[PDB]
Scaffold this active site. Structure first.
Site, PDB file in Angstrom:
ATOM      1  N   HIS A   1      -2.134  -7.916  -9.752  1.00 56.99           N
ATOM      2  CA  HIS A   1      -1.593  -7.093 -10.832  1.00 56.99           C
ATOM      3  C   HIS A   1      -0.670  -7.872 -11.764  1.00 56.99           C
ATOM      4  O   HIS A   1      -0.154  -8.933 -11.408  1.00 56.99           O
ATOM      5  CB  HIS A   1      -0.841  -5.889 -10.252  1.00 56.99           C
TER       6      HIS A   1
ATOM      7  N   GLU B   1       0.345  -4.265  -1.023  1.00 58.94           N
ATOM      8  CA  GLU B   1       1.025  -5.494  -0.650  1.00 58.94           C
ATOM      9  C   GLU B   1       1.608  -5.217   0.734  1.00 58.94           C
ATOM     10  O   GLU B   1       1.649  -4.064   1.169  1.00 58.94           O
ATOM     11  CB  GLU B   1       2.162  -5.770  -1.636  1.00 58.94           C
TER      12      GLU B   1
END
Length: 171
Positions: free
Chosen positions: A8, A74
């Site tokens: 991202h 994550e």
């Protein structure tokens, strides 16, 4: 299996150097810019994405409508969420650098994180684009015997679970 993993776009904690895991930070203006540049640079394949805002937003600006999966998130840093890398205890720095034996209080262990990520990839039955995080891309790259560090808003294509195909970074 051809899989395109996308890290991202940047958030504030990238330049601030703070551990960013499950803390739902938004993309910065530049992060959105990096996301938009990805549109047209990624193949038109089915898309999947972490349900965290920074990943979802990157997928959107890149022109995709991904199905969300928390499995692509994550690693959860637990009490270390938001901690400056600089002030991180050497023992933690070492564990993260060597990518092993890391289990922050209130967080997720690196081994559990790898299991979560690899199980998700194992379930992909056809080529796809995955909007995810630095730690996920790193886990995959490291498992393929390569340095897993890639720029925010960049991508890597791999033939899972055999080899890396290409690393794509845009200016």
């Amino acid at each position: 299996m051809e899989l395109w993993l996308v890290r991202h776009g940047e958030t504030l904690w990238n330049r601030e150097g703070r551990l960013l895991g499950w803390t739902d930070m938004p993309l910065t203006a530049e992060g959105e810019a990096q996301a938009r540049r990805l549109k047209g640079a990624l193949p038109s394949l089915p898309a999947f994405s972490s349900d965290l805002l920074r990943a979802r937003r990157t997928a959107e600006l890149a022109g995709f409508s991904p199905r969300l999966y928390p499995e692509l998130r994550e690693i959860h840093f637990g009490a270390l969420e938001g901690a400056l890398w600089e002030t991180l205890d050497p023992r933690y720095k070492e564990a993260l650098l060597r990518f092993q034996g890391f289990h922050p209080p209130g967080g997720e262990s690196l081994s559990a994180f790898q299991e979560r990520v690899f199980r998700f990839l194992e379930g992909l039955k056809a080529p796809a684009v995955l909007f995810t995080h630095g730690g996920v891309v790193r886990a995959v790259l490291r498992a393929l015997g390569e340095d897993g560090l890639v720029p925010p808003g960049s991508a890597v294509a791999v033939d899972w679970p055999r080899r890396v195909l290409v690393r794509l970074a845009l200016d």
